[PDB]
Amino acid sequence: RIPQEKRDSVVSEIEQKLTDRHQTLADAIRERELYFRMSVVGTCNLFCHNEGAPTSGKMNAENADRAIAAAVRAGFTRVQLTGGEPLLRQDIDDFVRVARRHVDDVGVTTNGTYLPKRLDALVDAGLARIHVSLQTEPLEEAGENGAWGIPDWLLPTVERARSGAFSLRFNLPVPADCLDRADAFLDLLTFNGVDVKVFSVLEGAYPLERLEEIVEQANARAVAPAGKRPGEVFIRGFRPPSGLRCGTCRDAARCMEQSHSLRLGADMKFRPCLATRDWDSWFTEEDLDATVREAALLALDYRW
Numbered sequence: 001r002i003p004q005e006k007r008d009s010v011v012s013e014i015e016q017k018l019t020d021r022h023q024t025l026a027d028a029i030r031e032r033e034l035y036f037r038m039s040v041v042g043t044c045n046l047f048c049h050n051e052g053a054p055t056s057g058k059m060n061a062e063n064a065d066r067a068i069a070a071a072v073r074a075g076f077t078r079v080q081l082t083g084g085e086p087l088l089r090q091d092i093d094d095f096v097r098v099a100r101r102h103v104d105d106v107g108v109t110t111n112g113t114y115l116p117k118r119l120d121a122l123v124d125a126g127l128a129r130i131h132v133s134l135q136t137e138p139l140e141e142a143g144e145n146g147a148w149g150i151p152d153w154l155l156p157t158v159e160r161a162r163s164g165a166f167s168l169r170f171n172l173p174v175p176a177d178c179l180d181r182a183d184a185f186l187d188l189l190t191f192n193g194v195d196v197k198v199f200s201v202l203e204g205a206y207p208l209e210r211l212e213e214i215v216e217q218a219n220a221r222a223v224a225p226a227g228k229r230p231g232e233v234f235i236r237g238f239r240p241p242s243g244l245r246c247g248t249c250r251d252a253a254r255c256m257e258q259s260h261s262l263r264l265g266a267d268m269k270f271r272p273c274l275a276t277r278d279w280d281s282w283f284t285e286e287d288l289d290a291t292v293r294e295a296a297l298l299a300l301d302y303r304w
């Protein structure tokens, strides 16, 4: 728990730090490329803090329209639909349509299993991005002889993305003993125009140097047919948090996210940070513009 006067004191410091830079809230959002990450689905009983709960009835198309509109007025130009599995809800394309009314950059982070059922409706709604969180086991099963392959239920999304319908990216976990399988697997993804974000998984330090080399090699090997651009592989470099709050934040050692964003969970809880809950705020039925702005001000506080 954080006293409101301490939260007010911190928010005032962020606003003062912005004026010291001759900067507005929207300019700081643009400089940090901060986006709005709205979780439209909650997963139940999902290991180190608590168990999850289903989606709140307030997480609906109407409130999503208010939250995105308030976020755009605060300075956000991109919305990403997330959660446990956003494609689990049948009205997922409704949220893409709502977000498309306020910004052009609407994306979805999904596990991909529901893409065959939802693909056409998402493109009709004008979805711009699809990020698929891959798992090692389906890649092994989709391949043969131990090599990794693309699961069947992802191929139509891959081809539709290569045709310019939307941007597609795969999040590829690479365990320590799978550097050679991931190396060859990156060729399949880049050839089909799929961007890849690789990251490490799991005594015995991780071979992080060779994985970085594999990324550089896979980008240099990248070829693509029909004069198209091949997919781009990249791995995020670590950088410690350095905001005003991070110096005395009990979770600073576990704050490793490099793509920062203002979050709105399926429980109507705004989250300026991922590693700590101290700065969360509630979704309000009144004065939503000021509530979104205050949470967005705290969302900047990680790098100055």
Ligand code: SF4
Pocket: 241, 242, 243, 245, 246, 247, 249, 250, 251, 252, 255, 272, 273, 274, 275, 276, 301, 302
């Ligand atoms: S960013 Fe939020 S979470 Fe990461 S350290 Fe600063 S305060 Fe703690």
